[PDB]
Amino acid sequence: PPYTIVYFPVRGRCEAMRMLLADQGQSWKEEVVTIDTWMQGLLKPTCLYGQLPKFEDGDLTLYQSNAILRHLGRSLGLYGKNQREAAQMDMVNDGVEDLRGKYVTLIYTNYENGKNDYVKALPGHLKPFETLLSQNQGGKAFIVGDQISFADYNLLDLLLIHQVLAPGCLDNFPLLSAYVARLSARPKIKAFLSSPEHVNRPINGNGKQ
Amino acid sequence: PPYTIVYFPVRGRCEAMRMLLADQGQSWKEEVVTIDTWMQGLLKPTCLYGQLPKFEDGDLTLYQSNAILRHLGRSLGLYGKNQREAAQMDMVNDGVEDLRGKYVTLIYTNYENGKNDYVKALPGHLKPFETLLSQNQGGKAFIVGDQISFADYNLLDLLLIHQVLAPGCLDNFPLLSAYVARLSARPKIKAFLSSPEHVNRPINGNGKQ
Numbered sequence: 001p002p003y004t005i006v007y008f009p010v011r012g013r014c015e016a017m018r019m020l021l022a023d024q025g026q027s028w029k030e031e032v033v034t035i036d037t038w039m040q041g042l043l044k045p046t047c048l049y050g051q052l053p054k055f056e057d058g059d060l061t062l063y064q065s066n067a068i069l070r071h072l073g074r075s076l077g078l079y080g081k082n083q084r085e086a087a088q089m090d091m092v093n094d095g096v097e098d099l100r101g102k103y104v105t106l107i108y109t110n111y112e113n114g115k116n117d118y119v120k121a122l123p124g125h126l127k128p129f130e131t132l133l134s135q136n137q138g139g140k141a142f143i144v145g146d147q148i149s150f151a152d153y154n155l156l157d158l159l160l161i162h163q164v165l166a167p168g169c170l171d172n173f174p175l176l177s178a179y180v181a182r183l184s185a186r187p188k189i190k191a192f193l194s195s196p197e198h199v200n201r202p203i204n205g206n207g208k209q
Numbered sequence: 210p211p212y213t214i215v216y217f218p219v220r221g222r223c224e225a226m227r228m229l230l231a232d233q234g235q236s237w238k239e240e241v242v243t244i245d246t247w248m249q250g251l252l253k254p255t256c257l258y259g260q261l262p263k264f265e266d267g268d269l270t271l272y273q274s275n276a277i278l279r280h281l282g283r284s285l286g287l288y289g290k291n292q293r294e295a296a297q298m299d300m301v302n303d304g305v306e307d308l309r310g311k312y313v314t315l316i317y318t319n320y321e322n323g324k325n326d327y328v329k330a331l332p333g334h335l336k337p338f339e340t341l342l343s344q345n346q347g348g349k350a351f352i353v354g355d356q357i358s359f360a361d362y363n364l365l366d367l368l369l370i371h372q373v374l375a376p377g378c379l380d381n382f383p384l385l386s387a388y389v390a391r392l393s394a395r396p397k398i399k400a401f402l403s404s405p406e407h408v409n410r411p412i413n414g415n416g417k418q
């Protein structure tokens with residue numbers, strides 16, 4: 001520590017880690033970069049891969065949302081109890097990112113004539129996560145263990161942004177519906193979810209959702 | 210162990226993992242799925258996310274080329290020396306993953322038209338890996354630290370695969386070039402890159418490169 005997130009005023013990718021850092025009682029500092037600020041062309045050239053978020057934790061400066069999500073998982077110990085769980089979780093996040101990536105192209109590239117297509121295909125993508133749950137205490141626990149992990153925050157987020165995009169999507173997946181109901185009811189998360197910092201934040205930075 | 214890979218008959222997202230198994234003196238089984246067996250509709254319904262590679266280590270059945278590299282990375286212990294390194298390691302890999310994704314889509318979706326652009330913006334995407342090296346021990350060690358990691362096998366593949374798509378691309382990046390020479394000279398590596406098993410294997414499915 002201390003924790004500082006650097007990124008455009010949007011939930012985008014950072015909302016997951018914000019939820020993790022909050023669930024785990026940590027306090028971080030937000031450092032907004034508006035598109036206007038970004039266009040100045042001074043900060044971007046410092047960014048390792050020319051993008052954001054840029055996360056700092058003490059003398060350690062990271063990049064890549066997932067690299068960050070995993071570092072938080074190793075540090076706050078939300079990355080499993082054995083090399084086996086670490087695999088299951090990683091197999092889950094890698095899947096989440098895969099889907100989210102599509103969600104990004106849809107919203108920032110072909111939203112108008114793309115949404116109908118993606119909304120129909122969506123179901124096939126959520127089924128695995130439902131299956132994963134069926135195969136663990138009957139979806140009464142978490143995505144991988146009996147404990148929360150970096151992967152759980154990420155999945156909870158993706159499902160939350162998909163409740164905006166394709167309303168009712170999880171109706172046919174009774175476990176994922178439970179999953180979201182519980183995780184969101186977690187005291188610290190519910191606190192965050194009603195937070196003005198989060199409620200006054202555009203899911204994506206172009207006005208489409 | 211034992212190690213068993215289930216993939217199509219191409220390098221693609223599996224060459225770097227096979228390549229790590231070689232360096233670590235390990236032996237694995239390659240159950241090769243020809244396209245026909247895939248189109249017949251045999252495995253797909255069983256596979257977590259449809260797609261392959263599928264991997265089995267003992268009784269652990271993994272999925273996702275990156276959840277695998279990380280697994281082999283933790284098991285064989287080549288995931289850095291401490292946390293700061295592990296995180297720095299992920300940021301390098303996820304970086305690799307991105308440039309790789311762009312590779313794929315140009316290949317299976319636009320080789321003809323797009324190759325013209327890919328090659329010209331490529332340098333902007335190689336820079337960071339030239340940067341990371343210069344910072345880390347004058348670029349005389351690996352991408353992160355002085356101990357080889359899973360991240361190095363992915364980045365080596367990516368670089369090799371890019372020399373074919375556009376010779377001399379690494380000519381303006383001394384360090385990265387040398388990183389390829391050094392990592393290629395490694396006893397098991399050289400052998401693997403010399404082995405017909407690897408050679409006769411086509412880089413991508415649609416024989417484009």
Ligand SMILES: N[C@@H](CCC(=O)N[C@@H](CS)C(=O)NCC(=O)O)C(=O)O
Pocket residue numbers: 012013050051052053063064065066303307
């Ligand atoms: N693989 C990176 C990609 C992050 C990303 O998409 N960054 C975008 C914002 S959502 C960005 O920085 N855009 C600014 C730019 O490219 O100029 C990650 O997942 O962290």
Ligand SMILES: N[C@@H](CCC(=O)N[C@@H](CS)C(=O)NCC(=O)O)C(=O)O
Pocket residue numbers: 094098217221222259260261262273274275
């Ligand atoms: N997200 C997976 C992607 C796996 C993948 O894209 N596999 C390709 C071959 S390179 C495939 O053909 N999958 C079968 C299909 O599309 O049905 C990973 O990280 O490795």
